[PDB]
């Protein structure tokens, strides 16, 4: 029934038998000798990068709308991964996203968890431009909004347009999963490295965006927990960085 996973020898996690979605059909892997536009052979840190990094839990309530995290920025302050981000210049890594809810049999709702590659976002004032502080915090979820935003340098946050200007109903085209509290309680997404160049800077490029959006609102009875906690866990897979030594 239950299964335990031990990555990095320092992290323990528990899961039940559930369907897993492997990205675009491919599995994360190291860089072969076929593709390269550089010289120094990449160093391959795996002792500490490959471990479960559990982010803070969030509260799903009746009037909540959704959240998004920008990756790889979400792991800027997360242990040795942040140190490798700071010390090196080029980088490549795939991820494994676990999302778990904790709701009884008396709650109800329906969530969509997607992984949008290159999710460029618009601005509230169509004339101005966004800034780096409004796009994403370090490791804190950025909330969507029910109504129209009116800031100057703030990302438009109407939920049904998803900030990208497209219908929210068609987001299923990307790697995704449905968490229906009636049947399911967890989701797993394995995302490889997707870009037009083999390596890129971690602080410059946002590889992708993780969005959690409820389509069916949360409902319950008076004598019940007012919220449902959502826990997100990330474990980098097949990380690479450039070389710092002379040829």
């Amino acid at each position: 029934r239950v299964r335990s996973i031990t990555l990095g020898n320092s992290t323990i996690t528990t899961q039940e038998c559930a369907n897993v979605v492997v990205g675009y059909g491919v599995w994360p892997s190291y860089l072969q000798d076929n593709e390269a536009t550089a010289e120094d052979q990449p160093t391959q840190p795996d002792v500490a990068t490959c471990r479960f990094y559990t982010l803070d839990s969030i509260q799903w309530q009746k009037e909540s709308d959704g959240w998004w995290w920008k990756f790889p920025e979400a792991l800027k302050n997360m242990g040795l991964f942040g140190q490798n981000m700071e010390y090196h210049y080029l980088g490549r890594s795939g991820y494994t996203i676990h999302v778990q809810c904790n709701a009884s049999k008396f709650h109800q709702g329906c969530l969509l968890v997607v992984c949008v590659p290159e999710a460029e976002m618009g601005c509230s004032d169509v004339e101005r431009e966004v800034v780096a502080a409004s796009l994403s915090s370090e490791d804190t979820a950025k909330s969507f909004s029910r109504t129209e935003s009116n800031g100057q340098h703030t990302v438009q946050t109407v939920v049904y347009n998803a900030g990208m200007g497209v219908g929210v109903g068609n987001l299923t085209i990307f790697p995704h999963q449905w968490i229906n509290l009636r049947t399911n309680n967890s989701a797993t997404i394995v995302m490889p490295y997707i870009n037009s160049v083999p390596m890129d800077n971690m602080f410059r490029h946002y590889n992708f965006t993780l969005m959690i959006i409820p389509f069916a609102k949360l409902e319950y009875t008076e004598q019940a927990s007012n919220y449902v906690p959502i826990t997100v866990t990330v474990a980098p897979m097949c990380a690479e960085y450039n070389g710092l030594r002379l040829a």
Partner: protein, 234 residues
């Protein structure tokens, strides 16, 4: 030696042309995941359908949620619509309809999935009725039962699939066609009520997904009507 069509520029011609930049070596291609070989792959993906677009919900997230009320609904209709992607207001903005809108001719079979977002302790039944192109929508539950129907129990099962077929006189339908009441109807009826124990919410939601089946054909590519302005940006 020189035919009449010798020295013209036909915009849909395919001839080789001199290379502006010979002696230039392009960058070899890498293996980026997710290559697209056909637009049909974009159409065989389930996308949530805004059934509940009643002019108070078009500018809200309530468009997608089909409301199922408890209480005591005798035999009232839950929802109903017409099967015409690309032209019906319900389907024209989903992935399937927006792919179909690019092509003047199209044909195939459409797959529908219904999912019950409700408490794990809720029990009930619904009747899903489908009427052929030449008929009329059922007016009450008994007429719907006597046609083509399926009884869906939300206690035993959570999702119900229904593959609307394609029976047409020709072999290609058109987006710009005036063929109302000739496209087929799908309705849902209250076979019984929604029964819940003390502590569960009395009302639930149904979500509807629509997508492509194995067989489709598209012909005569043309400009979409969704974009309006012909002005150039800046």
């Amino acid at each position: 030696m020189l035919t009449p069509g010798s020295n013209q520029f036909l915009t849909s011609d395919d001839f080789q042309s001199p290379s502006a930049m010979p002696q230039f070596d392009v960058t070899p291609e890498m293996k980026i995941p997710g290559e697209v070989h056909n637009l049909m792959e974009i159409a065989e993906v389930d996308s949530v359908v805004p059934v509940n677009n009643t002019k108070e919900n078009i500018n809200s997230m309530e468009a997608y949620r089909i409301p199922v009320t408890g209480g005591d609904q005798l035999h009232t209709q839950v929802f109903g619509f017409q099967m015409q992607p690309g032209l019906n207001s319900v389907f024209k903005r989903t992935l399937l309809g927006e792919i179909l809108n690019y092509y003047a001719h199209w044909s195939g079979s459409v797959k529908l999935t219904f999912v019950f977002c409700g408490s794990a302790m809720a029990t009930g039944k619904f009747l899903l009725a489908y009427s052929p192109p030449g008929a009329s929508p059922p007016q009450n539950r008994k007429q719907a039962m006597l046609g083509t129907h399926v009884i869906w129990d939300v206690g035993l099962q959570s999702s119900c699939v229904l593959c609307i077929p394609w029976i047409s006189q020709t072999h290609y339908r058109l987006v710009q066609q005036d063929e109302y009441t000739s496209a087929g109807y799908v309705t849902c009826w209250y076979q019984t009520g929604l029964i819940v124990p003390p502590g569960a919410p009395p009302s639930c939601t149904i979500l509807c997904f629509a997508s492509a089946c194995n067989d489709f054909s598209v012909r005569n590519l043309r400009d979409t009507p969704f974009i309006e302005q012909t002005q150039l940006l800046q």
